[PDB]
Design a protein around this nucleic acid. Structure first.
Ligand SMILES: Nc1ncnc2c1ncn2[C@H]1C[C@H](O)[C@@H](COP(=O)(O)CP(=O)(O)OP(=O)(O)O)O1
Ligand SMILES: [Mg+2]
Ligand SMILES: [Mg+2]
Lengths: 396, 542
DNA sequence: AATTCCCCCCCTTCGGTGCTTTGCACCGAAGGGGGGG
């Protein structure tokens, strides 16, 4: 069996340089690729193949085993082309089913697009090039060629247990039940066994939106009122109806920032009305499947990060916090990587699409250190923001 | 001979045809050298005579090798290169002697006539047609086509690098204890065996290479130290760069300055303290490469310092995987940094510098982080692992910066070393307004037609000023207004701006800017004892 | 006016992109050097 895969019209293919890797990662990649070539999953190629995608290795959580990962984002973009009850389940377990992927041969006209290069320590030898002969882990057309086989290893359980909702994204099966955990963790063992003969728990309901909140204090100084007016004017873009027209009248004339301004009755009324408006959810935003998701992350300090997922500016589909109380990993890069992975997982759970990330980090630091903490099998598209936010206290 | 290795299939780009470029006139000495080279190549089967059936041509020429007694025949395959299919290069970097481990026995081998020993794809040979012009015109030219990899073709290096890898794979698999560094046709071979057994293994490798049509002439077979390998001299315990010659010219041109900067950058890999910023600044603004550039006083002082560094004999050491990598960083001033990677004190594995200027405005902490990232990536390339850093920044300073910075930033395992100058932030912005300090409400306006603008402020005590500005923009007027606010205040000041450009720069704690308004504000911010800056939405009634 | 190719690096310049304070800041590609074959 072979599916005639094709690229998007007028698209060449991935040509991405291989980034340097550590000695442990290179040794793991060499061993994994030697085993894969011995099994025929990958084949050595020469330089006449002009395409290339980056490759590296990760160590999944509580695994102590190296896994080879390929950055197929460019190939996914160039390739020629949701369980809504999943967000409401209580326990969603993620299972790696990328191993069953390496048994379906890939179309020979498409193998050249899956080329990758293993580098060498100290450039002692030229990089070793391979291409995939089978469906690779990381490519978006790979789950689109196993759908048939998946919806047949699944049917004998997706019907015996009609309550459990199963979704598949890339190499991951998100299986979400409403059973007691001890039970959901036995069904999942049963599903594992039922995938063994045929060949990480999320809690989507304990997920909350972070609302826009105004400060509550006894006395309001000029600085406090100026900060409140700025926050309310910024929020007026998101929530139309925010007056902030009489709170901008207590700030009339030149006054010291530490001067206490008594809050007038009209000002207090308007403040209470604006608090009520901010408390109620924003109405009028709908997930458009044709558009792409954008996730913005803001560092808040003390291991706190805020994030907003939206498709149009100021129309937020989700707002949240990733609070990893800076403890042993006082690594900003580790916290940011862990936040990106969590946001991507909830985006796939809710909308089925990974978001494009606006990372609050220098590009070079990210490319240096993100592979050291990544533990997912997917990689989202990310762009790097090089401008202070200030609208960072408007989300925390 | 010619390798029995399989040829790499090569095709032209879709819809394109072979080159039809005429041969340019050639010097009679060059013509004779090319005639003799082509005669020997045709006798060996490396090139084949062709007739009218081939409509393609490509200019040929010759240069002088490092042998200075033999000629290197080159073909100007630029048209064919443009019409040739794309390749992926397998050479991802350059080996470094600092990444070499100590070996009891070392042998350097150079494969003779490397490219011309690897056959070329038969369907692609017709596109490699060239013509050797006759001495003094008159007779028609002898037309050949390449049967092997030509020098000048964009596919030759990668194809040769793959062929050499394939040839070396069996020997390396059957001798896993022998270390072979393969860079094109250059082969470094290190082993811990005795000299007799090592020479036996070297002879075995030479026989293995000769069976694949690759000769290893004794002329370029090095058996005794020092070994000339990849631009370095390798001794049993130490390595050094091959001698680096700095011009002693009294008149410098743009090209000469570029050459000197490149040579000093090359020498900075092992010679500590090499600085090039003053000399590199001479290249800005210039145009012609032949334009004589008068060396400034700062440039002359850096050149003298670099010369004083390069007269002493320095050497690197070989990597010891049992011990730990330590990279120590020092500030050189003016955004320049040196670093030394070593495993034992006073025995450097390698040396380097970082002087890249990223961003219009930055501080020493950001540049130190950039230098740490550069050293980390270089160490991952060379030794495959991140070193332990000795940074001239206090842990408190880094803690304050990275906790109070709006970007995610990190530095790997590092310890503070008390070697001045130390990396520190030169001012801090108050998190809350200062009680008892005059509050400045500042603003800057500029119509974008006449390029004239206003910078003004008023204080809570009644003072105000409205300086006018020429040829400034809105951004620049807001920066000017903040500058007035800083100038006309005491040691403690509250400033309220309605500009997020201004506040965005000033909040990143710059210590140096590629602007004199930001640089001037920086000196005012370092003098004040406490400064709170606040943004207020603009036209709102505030 | 001498004409080639591939690889790594540094340093400087320019045009494109993104945001929207329309100038300014930033990043990649391309030019010059160094080194390697
Ligand atoms: N300037 C240049 N232009 C194009 N290609 C160049 C090159 N310098 C080296 N190369 C490539 C081709 C050589 O085959 C190969 C080996 O580099 P080499 O300079 O040692 C000469 P090789 O042809 O092996 O023969 P021999 O002189 O040792 O007998 O490196
Ligand atoms: Mg040589
Ligand atoms: Mg040679």
């Amino acid at each position: 069996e072979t599916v005639p895969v094709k690229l998007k019209p007028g698209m060449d293919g991935p040509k991405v340089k291989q980034w340097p890797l550590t000695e442990e990662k290179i040794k793991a990649l060499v061993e994994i690729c030697t085993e894969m070539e011995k099994e025929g999953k990958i084949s050595k190629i020469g330089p006449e193949n002009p395409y290339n995608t980056p490759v590296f290795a990760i160590k999944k959580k509580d695994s102590t085993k190296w896994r080879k990962l390929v950055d197929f984002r460019e190939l996914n973009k160039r390739t020629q082309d949701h369980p809504a009850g999943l967000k409401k389940k209580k326990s969603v377990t993620v299972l790696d089913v990328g191993d069953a992927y390496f048994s379906v041969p890939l179309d020979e006209d498409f193998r050249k697009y899956t080329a990758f290069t293993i580098p060498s320590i100290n450039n002692e030898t030229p990089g070793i090039r391979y291409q995939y002969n089978v469906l690779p882990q990381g490519w978006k057309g790979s789950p689109a060629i196993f759908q048939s086989s998946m919806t047949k290893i699944l049917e004998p359980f997706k019907k015996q247990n009609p309550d459990i909702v199963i979704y598949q994204y890339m190499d991951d099966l998100y299986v979400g039940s409403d059973l007691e955990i001890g039970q959901h963790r036995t069904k999942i063992e049963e599903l594992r066994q039922h995938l063994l003969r045929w060949g990480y728990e999320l809690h989507p309901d304990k997920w909350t939106v972070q609302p826009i909140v105004l400060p509550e204090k006894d006395s309001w100084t000029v600085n406090d009122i100026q900060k409140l007016v700025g926050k309310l004017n910024w929020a007026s873009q998101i929530y139309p109806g925010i007056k902030v027209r009489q709170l901008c009248k207590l700030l009339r004339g030149t006054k010291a920032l530490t001067e206490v301004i008594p809050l007038t009755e009209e000002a207090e009324l308007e403040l209470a009305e604006n608090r009520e408006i901010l408390k109620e959810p924003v109405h009028g935003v709908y997930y458009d499947p044709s558009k792409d998701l954008i996730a913005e992350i803001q560092k808040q300090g003390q291991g706190q990060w805020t994030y907003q997922i939206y498709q149009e500016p100021f129309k937020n589909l989700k707002t949240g916090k990733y609070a990893r109380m800076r403890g042993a990993h006082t690594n900003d890069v580790k916290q940011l990587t862990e936040a990106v992975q969590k946001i991507t997982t909830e985006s796939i759970v809710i909308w089925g699409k990974t978001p494009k990330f606006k990372l609050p980090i220098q590009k070079e630091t990210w490319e240096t250190w993100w592979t050291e903490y990544w533990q997912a099998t997917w990689i989202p598209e990310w762009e790097f923001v090089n401008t202070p936010p200030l609208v960072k206290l408007w989300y925390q | 001979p010619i390798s029995p290795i399989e040829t790499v299939p090569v095709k032209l780009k879709p819809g394109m045809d072979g080159p039809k470029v005429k041969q340019w006139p050639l010097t009679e000495e060059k013509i004779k050298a090319l005639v003799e080279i082509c005669t020997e190549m045709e006798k060996e089967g490396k090139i084949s005579k062709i007739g009218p059936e081939n409509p393609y041509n490509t200019p040929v020429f010759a240069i002088k090798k490092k042998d200075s007694t033999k000629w290197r025949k080159l073909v100007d395959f630029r048209e064919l290169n443009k019409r040739t299919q794309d390749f992926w290069e397998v050479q991802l970097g350059i080996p470094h002697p600092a990444g070499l481990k100590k070996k009891k026995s070392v042998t350097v081998l150079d494969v003779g006539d490397a490219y011309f020993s690897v056959p070329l794809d038969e369907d692609f040979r017709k596109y490699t047609a060239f013509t050797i012009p006759s001495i003094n015109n008159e007779t028609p030219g002898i037309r050949y086509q390449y049967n092997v990899l030509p020098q000048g073709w964009k596919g030759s290096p990668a194809i040769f690098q793959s062929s050499m890898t394939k040839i070396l794979e069996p020997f390396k698999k059957q001798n896993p204890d022998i270390v072979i560094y393969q860079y094109m046709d250059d082969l470094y071979v290190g082993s811990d065996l005795e000299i007799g057994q090592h020479r036996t293994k070297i002879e075995e490798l030479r026989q293995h290479l000769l069976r694949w049509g690759l000769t290893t002439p004794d002329k370029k077979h090095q058996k005794e130290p020092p070994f000339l390998w990849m631009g370095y001299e390798l001794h049993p315990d130490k390595w050094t760069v091959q001698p680096i010659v700095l011009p002693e010219k009294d008149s410098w041109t743009v090209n000469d300055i570029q050459k000197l900067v490149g040579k000093l950058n090359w020498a900075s890999q092992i010679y500590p303290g090499i600085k090039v910023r003053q000399l590199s600044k001479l290249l800005r603004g210039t145009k012609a490469l032949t334009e004589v550039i008068p060396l400034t006083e700062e440039a002359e002082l850096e050149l003298a310092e670099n010369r004083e560094i390069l007269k002493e004999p320095v050497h690197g050491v070989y990597y010891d995987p049992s011990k730990d990598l330590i990279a120590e960083i020092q500030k050189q001033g003016q955004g320049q940094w040196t670093y030394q990677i070593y495993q034992e004190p006073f025995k450097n594995l390698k040396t380097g510098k970082y002087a890249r200027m990223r961003g219009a405005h930055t501080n020493d902490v950001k540049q130190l982080t950039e230098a740490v990232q550069k050293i980390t990536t270089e160490s991952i390339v060379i030794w495959g692992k991140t070193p332990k850093f000795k940074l001239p920044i206090q842990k408190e300073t880094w803690e304050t910066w990275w906790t109070e910075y709006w970007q995610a930033t990190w530095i790997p395992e590092w310890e503070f070393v008390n070697t001045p100058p130390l990396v520190k932030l030169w001012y801090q912005l108050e998190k809350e307004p200062i009680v008892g300090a005059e509050t400045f409400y500042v603003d800057g306006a500029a119509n974008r037609e006449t390029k004239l603008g206003k910078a003004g402020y008023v204080t809570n005590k009644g003072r105000q000023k409205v300086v006018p500005l020429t040829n400034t923009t809105n951004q620049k007027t807001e920066l000017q207004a903040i500058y007035l606010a800083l100038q006309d205040s005491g040691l403690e000041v509250n400033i309220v701006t309605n500009s997020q450009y201004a506040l965005g720069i000033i909040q990143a704690q710059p210590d140096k800017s590629e602007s004199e308004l930001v640089n001037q504000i920086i000196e005012q911010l370092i003098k004040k004892e406490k400064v709170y800056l606040a943004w207020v939405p603009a036209h709102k009634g505030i």
